[PDB]
Structure formats: C-alpha cells, structure tokens
C-alpha cells in the first residue's frame, strides 16, 4: 500500500495470445492481460477483467522460447506448460521491444518458480533490452 500496479511489481497489457486448438481456426487474439506472481490471466478486454478469464494459465515449470526477428518487428514468447496431465502450448505476441522485455522476463522467472519481485528480474528485462539492438 501506498502504492500501485508497480509497486506489485505486475504487468497488465494489451498481448496477444494465440493459443491453436483440435479443429479450430485461432490467431493471434488481442487480449486484456495481467502478470501476477507467476500466472497470465487472459481477458476479453479492459471492461471484462473483474470476471473470470477467457484464458488462465500458471507459468511455474514452463518452457519459455524467443521468436524473435528485429527486422520483422516479431517479439513473440512461445510456452510450453505442465498440467497435471499433459503439457499446454500458446504464443504471447508482444508490440515492442520494451513490451516484449518486461512479459519475456516474467515468463522466465515465472518457470523458475520466481515472481517479478525477484532481483533477477530487472537482470532479464536489461539484458533482453541490450541484445534487441543492432550492432
């Protein structure tokens, strides 16, 4: 308290989420996002976030995956995720290089077992920032 979102710290964003499924035509959707301890909640906008998510997932265990081209603009996070039984795959697509830092960073930790909270985080989102450049 006497804080806000980022005294948490936590994410919450506009991503997109493609998540493919058996038989079903899927995108990258626009989602409402947030980033809290080590889970995504996924909503179908800003106006429908008190409710329940159109997609929730705990990140702890996870493979977390650069697809990334500077170039192309392309900062995409794919995960791989540990169910009880099975394993979940689904993209995060993110707009920018700061963006895409912040949310690639969380994710990390996150399969670590670690929040945002941790010292490492502000090691990965730098270090990701850093090497985003061009030479």
């Given at each position: 308290?006497?804080?806000?979102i980022?005294?948490?710290?936590?994410?919450?964003?506009?991503?997109?989420?493609?998540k493919?499924?058996?038989?079903?035509?899927?995108?990258?959707?626009?989602?409402?996002?947030?980033?809290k301890?080590?889970?995504?909640?996924c909503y179908?906008?800003?106006?429908?976030?008190?409710?329940?998510?159109?997609?929730?997932?705990?990140?702890?265990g996870?493979?977390?995956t650069?697809?990334?081209?500077?170039?192309?603009?392309?900062?995409?996070?794919k995960?791989?995720?540990?169910?009880?039984?099975?394993?979940?795959?689904?993209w995060?697509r993110c707009?920018?290089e700061?963006?895409?830092?912040?949310?690639?960073?969380a994710?990390?930790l996150?399969?670590?077992?670690k929040?945002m909270?941790?010292?490492?985080?502000?090691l990965?989102?730098?270090?990701?920032?850093?090497?985003?450049?061009?030479?």
């Open positions: 308290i006497l804080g806000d980022t005294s948490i710290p936590e994410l919450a964003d506009y991503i997109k989420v493609f493919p499924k058996k038989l079903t035509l899927k995108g990258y959707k626009q989602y409402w996002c947030t980033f301890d080590t889970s995504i909640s179908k906008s800003k106006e429908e976030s008190s409710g329940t998510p159109a997609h929730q997932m705990n990140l702890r996870c493979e977390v650069p697809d990334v081209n500077i170039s192309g603009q392309k900062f995409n996070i995960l791989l995720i540990p169910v009880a039984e099975g394993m979940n795959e689904i995060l707009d920018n700061k963006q895409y830092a912040h949310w690639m960073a994710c990390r996150a399969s670590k077992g929040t909270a941790d010292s490492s985080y502000n990965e989102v730098q270090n990701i920032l850093s090497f985003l450049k061009m030479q």
